[PDB]
Design a protein around this ligand. Structure first.
Ligand SMILES: *[C@@H]1O[C@H](CO)[C@@H](O[C@@H]2O[C@H](CO)[C@@H](O[C@@H]3O[C@H](CO)[C@@H](O)[C@H](O)[C@@H]3O)[C@H](O)[C@H]2NC(C)=O)[C@H](O)[C@H]1NC(C)=O
Ligand SMILES: O=c1ccn([C@@H]2O[C@H](COP(=O)(O)OP(=O)(O)O)[C@@H](O)[C@H]2O)c(=O)[nH]1
Ligand SMILES: O=c1ccn([C@@H]2O[C@H](COP(=O)(O)OP(=O)(O)O)[C@@H](O)[C@H]2O)c(=O)[nH]1
Ligand SMILES: *[C@@H]1O[C@H](CO)[C@@H](O)[C@H](O)[C@H]1NC(C)=O
Ligand SMILES: [Mn+2]
Lengths: 583, 571
């Protein structure tokens, strides 16, 4: 009854497996006999490189097939044949009780329907182009339709380098695609010449899509083809304010991600398209949703949008691109986090976490479902940062004088001393003895007066998201060796602050403990250093902002930074040249 | 048709676009008092309209809220006889008890092949995600008794379940939990609630517990939820597959706890994990939800129409904060518009705006000194002096950056804050005529600091405010600088969006008063920046002004300024 197409979590899912242990996902072993596409390989590597990967099927409560399923078009070069009996032969399939299926294309030329090919049964499908008429509200996940050139890790860092008021540029609505003479899904693009005006709204289409370039051309191909020139598409998305993303052969398109990257507010025309991550993302803040039936009056509606709303839409679009759509790893982690939050109804991210900086991928509800326990949403609420902090000292005498000085601080609620398993990076573990949100990590070799502690705390009061610390080190790029460097003497700028004398949030401790993979922690422990470097990397990545400075061992730093950058995919560190001092 | 959504089963041609982005609803002229007052609430709302050929939504005058006496065949005949059914493409129906004595279908049993349904008891299978709206089930107790507005705090009971005629399994599990813990869980039995040798009044007993339990006994939706929200206790819904009312726009994760019916014996342990701060937050959210959406039928109708209008007009939809923020935190909210954390590069610079009046020897020194700094994209001179004429073109200083002189129709001090379309940068330096004691490297470092904080003021002068107990009013202080809360606009880097805000989005008549009094413009700019961005200022190195500060604080209703003790200097 409810176990067919109308599958939900209360019927087509086994919560018993997920209740036994943590939320883990299991990848089927590769058969070493079938072709695997680059996109599916990237997805599988993102799953395996994530913290939810486990090798034991019994422990995991979620499964993902290693057989390629992104390309389900019978004429596609990446299609895998005879999947109907191939999927059924798996011993662990179990009719897809807890199976997640990734997909990007479905259907054939006559009709691009939900032709998944093999009978999924009760499995959940993370198909990209899902119509709202066949989308399960709390079972399926909609993902963006990425291309084969989408970066595995890292990103393009957006395009919007200047926030110029007014946001309006030398264009209003642009489009440069390819119309289709025959088929399904070309009605919206064949009528764009009604909307087209040239001066500000320019819509361009081409009817040369194969054999029909001169065979079945109508009396308007020639006019469109001549005007389809002298206007680069990339060189158009940079001067445009609104990007039109209509429906073609399939509801989704690569144009959506390009519009998100180019900071132009998308204006979707694909009617009944379940937007990517629609169950957690409010697309009314980062996009303008429109209906293709009212195609004629679209430019009037676009002009009716106010200036401040346009600015907010552009900024939210850039945030969404930098948070959830930059890389395929981010997409996979977003889907996995949505599925994980779908399990515990009392431990889940609310609608504000996903749609606000930094986003759901960096905010873990398992730490707390209350927004006041995070340093990110103080301004959104009527709350102020806590007035007390718990100092943390990791000891492996100056320490005797240091503890007295730190205790004299008025805002110091308590002091925790760590003595060493001699894991020097274990000081970032979350401890139940910590009550206040702010945490001061202190080294026994650090000399710090109580007035300086008070100044650091009062500075952190204005910046609860960043790290405020006295020691600062920067990073440089070495052209000769093509690897990132590390300098710690007389640096003009800085991009990192050592945790030994820095103030930050205990949620950063929790995120370091429960977010970064075990491989980086193992490398840090084996090298017996490079833990503050990883903490600064995580904080720069989550905040997108540099820290704040207030007033053989060296060679290992370069290898540490290279490994961290390789895992992250880019360099989250941002140079800073300012130094906050008391007045 | 359960399969279709708004994209196919709804007609948008009737309501294409209007300058006032408001949906148009009509009520057919043909009922319980509930439906009568719902129709009255629809009538006196902004969504009401005439001229049927110009309207979009239709609301029939049919009693459909209660299904006990629904007469499904009669309802189908009425829907056919509406004379504007048109397959029911744009007809909205209100319901709160969509259950049947033989079986609780969790949906309305009328044909409604294409109609729009607003039910109270909605399951995940019978609810159209993008089409239907889940509305609260009305309880007359909300308006019949006016409970006191008791603030959040400790209560004698931790868990409470006051329902009548529950299934024996739920009652047995509740009794097991009560005997397992005791003195905190209080289960009540049969307006009057009875315990073992104890009698409690149903409306007021809920005020004595912080968590109230709601169970699925019939229709998947119980009116006890409204009473739970009214009394301030956090609802604990145990219905396995039930979508909470107004879940599309409201954030129920911050107001209610959903525990599956399978883990009914584990409810207490789940509720224990929630800290007290979140408990108070959820109590406030529940009270706000009751007083805004559950208190009155007019509230239900307005919320439903607002949700539908947001669906029809996403570009004009109200914000999440507007939907689900209590008025106190809405007053305390910030909602910074320059929330995107980007660092602009050095390719674009800043446009220096110089305000001069009856002085030309200081103007030339200012221009010469500013021209020494790098990254000076443009330099604009504002000539407020109407009687005097600008100097000849030859006499202007020789610089390599584009210099232009602005012609001012009038002489108002707020001419430095007008957003000029000739400015091509986002940073706008505002150095006045007398500011000549600044070096080039100082301005360059100020612009460097501003690049890291583009959403807040970066200025060299440092001033602050203070509170005087003798006069019970705000004062001004500048002699001693231990903390900084204000930055004078003279030689102060800020976003031109701040210029736009000062010119156009200013509360009441603040600007009309600065111009009249020809003073206190930096004060107004600081107040506006603090109120809009919710962030302090960055500093880089009398009676009239006090009245200015007091008037600005009175207009805002509070003090948007923040006190900080940090300044930026080169490393
Ligand atoms: C930024 O400025 C706005 C004003 O445009 C501030 O909103 C105002 O906040 C005050 C209290 O903070 C509100 O006063 C309240 O009025 C209600 C009656 O409506 C009264 O019952 C309360 O006791 C209180 O006096 C005022 O209404 C409100 N203005 C508007 C238009 O809602 C806002 O608080 C400022 N933000 C910051 C961070 O300073
Ligand atoms: O001048 C153009 C036109 C299209 N495209 C690419 O083509 C895709 C969208 O256009 P197309 O008409 O091919 O989409 P379709 O309608 O075929 O799905 C995207 O990947 C664009 O980057 C492009 O790069 N330049
Ligand atoms: O009608 C007027 C009056 C004043 N100002 C400007 O207001 C400032 C007043 O100068 P100053 O800051 O020295 O005054 P103070 O507060 O120091 O007495 C200068 O920039 C003037 O150009 C102006 O533009 N028009
Ligand atoms: C669009 O912006 C780019 C800057 O990236 C600029 O080079 C280009 O000239 C602009 N296009 C037009 C038509 O001016
Ligand atoms: Mn002066």
């Amino acid at each position: 009854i409810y176990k067919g197409k109308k599958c939900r979590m209360e019927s087509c899912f086994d919560f018993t497996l997920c209740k036994k242990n943590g939320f883990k996902v299991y990848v089927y072993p590769q058969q070493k006999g079938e072709k695997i596409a680059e996109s599916y390989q990237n997805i599988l590597a993102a799953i395996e490189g994530s913290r939810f990967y486990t090798s034991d099927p019994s422990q995991a409560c979620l499964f993902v097939l290693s057989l390629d399923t992104l390309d389900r078009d019978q004429l596609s070069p990446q299609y895998v044949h005879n999947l109907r009996s191939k999927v059924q032969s798996l011993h662990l399939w179990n009719n897809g009780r807890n199976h997640l299926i990734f997909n990007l294309y479905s259907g054939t030329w006559p009709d691009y329907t939900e032709d998944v090919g093999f009978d999924i049964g009760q499995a959940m499908l993370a198909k990209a182009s899902i119509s709202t008429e066949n989308f399960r509200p709390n079972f399926d996940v909609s993902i963006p339709l990425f291309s084969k050139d989408h970066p595995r890790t890292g990103g393009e860092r957006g395009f919007l380098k200047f926030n110029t008021i007014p946001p309006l540029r030398k264009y209003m609505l642009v489009f440069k695609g390819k119309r289709y003479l025959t088929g399904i899904g070309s009605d919206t693009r064949n009528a764009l010449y009604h909307v087209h005006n040239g001066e500000d709204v320019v819509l361009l289409t081409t009817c040369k899509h194969g054999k029909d370039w001169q065979k079945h051309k109508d009396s308007r191909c020639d006019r469109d083809n001549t005007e389809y020139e002298k206007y680069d598409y990339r060189e158009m998305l940079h001067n445009a304010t609104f990007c039109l993303v209509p429906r073609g052969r399939r509801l989704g398109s690569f144009r959506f991600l390009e519009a998100l990257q180019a900071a132009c507010v998308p204006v979707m025309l694909s009617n009944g398209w379940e937007l990517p991550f629609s169950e957690v993302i409010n697309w009314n803040q980062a996009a303008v949703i429109g209906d293709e039936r009212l195609l004629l009056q679209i430019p009037s509606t676009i002009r009716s949008i106010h200036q401040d709303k346009i600015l907010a839409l552009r900024q939210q679009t850039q945030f969404l691109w930098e948070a959830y759509f930059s890389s395929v790893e981010k997409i996979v982690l977003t889907t996995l986090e949505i599925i994980q939050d779908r399990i515990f109804k009392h431990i889940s991210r609310n609608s504000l976490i996903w749609n606000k900086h930094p986003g759901g991928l960096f905010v873990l509800p398992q730490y707390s479902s209350y927004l006041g326990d995070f340093p990110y949403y103080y301004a959104n609420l009527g709350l102020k940062p806590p007035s007390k902090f718990t100092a943390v000292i990791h000891a492996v005498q100056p320490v005797l004088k240091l503890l007295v000085a730190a205790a004299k601080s008025q805002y110091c609620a308590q002091i925790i001393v760590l003595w060493n398993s001699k894991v020097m990076s274990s000081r970032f573990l979350p401890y139940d003895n910590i009550i206040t949100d702010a945490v001061l990590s202190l080294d026994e070799d650090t000399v710090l007066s109580t007035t300086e502690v008070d100044f650091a705390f009062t500075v952190w009061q204005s910046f609860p998201e960043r790290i405020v610390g006295y020691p600062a080190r920067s990073h440089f790029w070495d052209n000769s060796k093509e690897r990132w460097g590390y300098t710690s003497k007389w640096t003009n700028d800085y991009s990192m602050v050592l945790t030994g004398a820095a103030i930050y949030h205990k949620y950063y401790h929790y995120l370091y403990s429960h977010y970064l993979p075990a491989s980086l922690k193992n490398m840090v422990d084996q090298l017996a250093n490079c833990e503050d470097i990883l903490m600064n990397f995580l904080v720069s990545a989550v905040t997108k902002l540099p820290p704040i400075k207030v007033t053989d061992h060296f060679a290992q730093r370069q290898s540490c930074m290279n490994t961290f950058a390789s895992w992250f995919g880019y360099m989250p560190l941002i140079h800073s040249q300012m130094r906050l001092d008391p007045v | 048709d359960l399969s279709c959504r708004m994209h196919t089963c709804f007609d948008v041609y009737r309501c294409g676009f209007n300058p006032k982005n408001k949906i148009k609803v009509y009520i057919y002229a043909l009922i319980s008092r509930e439906y009568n007052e719902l129709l009255m609430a629809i009538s006196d709302s902004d969504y009401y309209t005439d001229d049927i050929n110009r309207a979009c939504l239709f609301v029939p005058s049919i009693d459909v809220l209660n299904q006990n006496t629904l007469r499904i065949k009669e309802t189908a005949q009425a829907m056919a006889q509406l004379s504007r059914w048109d397959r029911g493409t744009n007809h909205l129906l209100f319901n709160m008890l969509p259950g049947g004595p033989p079986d609780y279908n969790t949906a309305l049993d009328v044909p409604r092949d294409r109609a729009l349904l607003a039910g109270g008891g909605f399951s995940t299978w019978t609810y159209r995600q993008g089409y239907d709206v889940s509305i609260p089930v009305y309880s007359p107790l909300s308006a019949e008794v006016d409970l006191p507005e008791k603030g959040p705090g400790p209560r004698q009971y931790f868990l409470l379940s006051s329902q009548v005629g529950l299934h024996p399994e739920y009652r047995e599990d509740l009794e097991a939990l009560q005997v397992k813990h005791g003195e905190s869980v209080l289960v009540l039995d049969k307006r009057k609630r009875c315990h073992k040798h104890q009698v409690f009044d149903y409306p007021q007993v809920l005020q004595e517990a912080t968590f109230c339990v709601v169970l699925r006994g019939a229709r998947l939706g119980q009116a006890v939820l409204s009473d739970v929200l009214q009394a301030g206790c956090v609802p604990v819904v145990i219905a396995d597959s039930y979508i909470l009312p107004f879940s599309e726009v409201l954030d129920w994760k911050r107001a209610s706890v959903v525990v599956p019916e399978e883990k009914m014996s584990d409810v207490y342990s789940i509720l224990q994990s929630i800290p007290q701060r979140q408990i108070e937050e959820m109590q406030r959210q529940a009270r706000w939800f009751w007083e805004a959406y559950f208190q009155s039928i007019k509230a239900i109708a307005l919320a439903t129409l607002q949700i539908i209008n947001d669906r029809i007009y996403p570009y004009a939809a109200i914000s999440y904060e507007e939907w689900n923020d209590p008025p106190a935190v809405k007053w305390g909210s910030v909602s910074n518009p320059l929330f995107l954390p980007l660092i602009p590069p050095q390719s674009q610079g800043f446009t220096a705006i110089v305000l001069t009046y009856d002085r030309v020897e200081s103007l030339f020194r200012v221009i010469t000194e500013v021209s020494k700094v790098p990254s000076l994209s443009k330099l604009l001179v504002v000539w407020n002096n109407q009687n005097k004429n600008p100097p000849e073109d030859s006499l202007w200083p020789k610089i390599r950056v584009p210099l232009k002189v602005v012609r001012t129709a009038e002489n108002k001090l707020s001419n430095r804050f007008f957003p000029y379309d000739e400015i091509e940068t986002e940073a706008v330096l505002a150095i006045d005529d007398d500011i000549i004691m600044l070096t080039s490297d100082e301005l360059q470092f100020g612009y460097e600091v501003w690049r890291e904080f583009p959403d807040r003021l970066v200025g060299y002068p440092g001033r602050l405010h203070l509170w005087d107990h003798e006069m019970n009013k705000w004062k001004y202080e500048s002699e001693w600088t231990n903390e900084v809360s204000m930055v004078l606009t003279g030689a102060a880097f800020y976003h031109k969006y701040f210029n736009y805000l000062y010119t156009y989005k200013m509360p009441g008549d603040i600007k009309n008063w600065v111009d009249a009094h020809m003073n206190c413009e930096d004060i107004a700019m600081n107040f506006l920046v603090a109120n809009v961005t919710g962030k302090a200022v960055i500093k880089v190195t009398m009676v009239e002004r006090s009245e200015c500060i007091n008037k600005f604080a009175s207009v805002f209703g509070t003090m948007p300024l923040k006190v900080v003790e940090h300044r930026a200097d080169p490393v």
